[PDB]
Amino acid sequence: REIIENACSSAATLVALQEMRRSALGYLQNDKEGQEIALQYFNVLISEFEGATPSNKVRQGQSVDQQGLELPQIYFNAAEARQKFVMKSGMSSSEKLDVVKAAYRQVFERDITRAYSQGISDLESKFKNGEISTKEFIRRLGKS
């Protein structure tokens, strides 16, 4: 909408897409089951066009020579997200265990607990306590 704000009318698009929705759900009056599916889906098309753009997410070089860049919020939202495994303190144990699965998977490139049956077990206990943070669990793994 903020692309076509100069050429097209923003008010003409909302009234066109609403009656595009209303005439399409009038075609689905017979099945009685998919009409509420497309009413959920056309309402995404109306409500996403209601808002304006979000801003561009921007990376910054903390080194002075590495250049800063920019990325559209669209382009990050379309690609899949890497599963960020945050570990907080009092979470449950199975949800605690797949974090320390993935911490080995990040550093040692594969799950060497599952595949080689080895990994230092005293460090996980300080990790699962909430004693050391996840920054420290990487660093004491890196000096091992």
Instruction: Print the binding letters for residues 78-117 with other proteins: x by CB under 8 A, - otherwise.
Output: xxxxxxxxxxxxxxxxxx-x-x--xx--xx-xx---xxxx
Q: Which two tokens stand for residue 79?
A: 């690609």
Question: Is residue 52 a contact residue for ligand CYC (CB under 6 A)?
Answer: no
Return d(Cα 29, Cα 77) in angstroms, integer.
34
Question: Is residue 120 a contact residue for other proteins (CB under 8 A)?
Answer: no
> What are phi and psi for residue 116, nearest 5 degrees?
-120, 0
Q: Which does 95 bind (CB under 5 to 8 A by kind): ligand CYC, other proteins, none?
A: other proteins
Instruction: Print the binding letters for residues 7-46 with ligand CYC: x by CB under 6 A, - otherwise.
Output: xxx--xx---------------------------------
CA distances, 134 to each of 73, 98, 99 (Å): 28, 13, 10
- Please pick, from the candidates 4, 15, 37, 97, the single residue that binds ligand CYC as defined by CB under 6 A: 4
Return d(Cα 66, Cα 63) in angstroms, integer.
6
Question: Is residue 74 a contact residue for ligand CYC (CB under 6 A)?
Answer: no
Tell me the site size for ligand CYC, rule CB under 6 A. Answer: 9
Q: Which two tokens stand for residue 3?
A: 């692309």
Contacts of range 15-23, beta carbons closer than 8 Å, 24 or more positions apart: 17/45, 17/46, 17/49, 18/46, 21/45, 21/46
If the CB atoms of residues 31 and 77 are measured against ligand CYC, the closer one turns out to be: 77
Question: Is residue 125 a contact residue for other proteins (CB under 8 A)?
Answer: no
Q: Which residue ranges make up the site for ligand CYC (CB under 6 A)?
A: 3-4, 7-9, 12-13, 69, 71
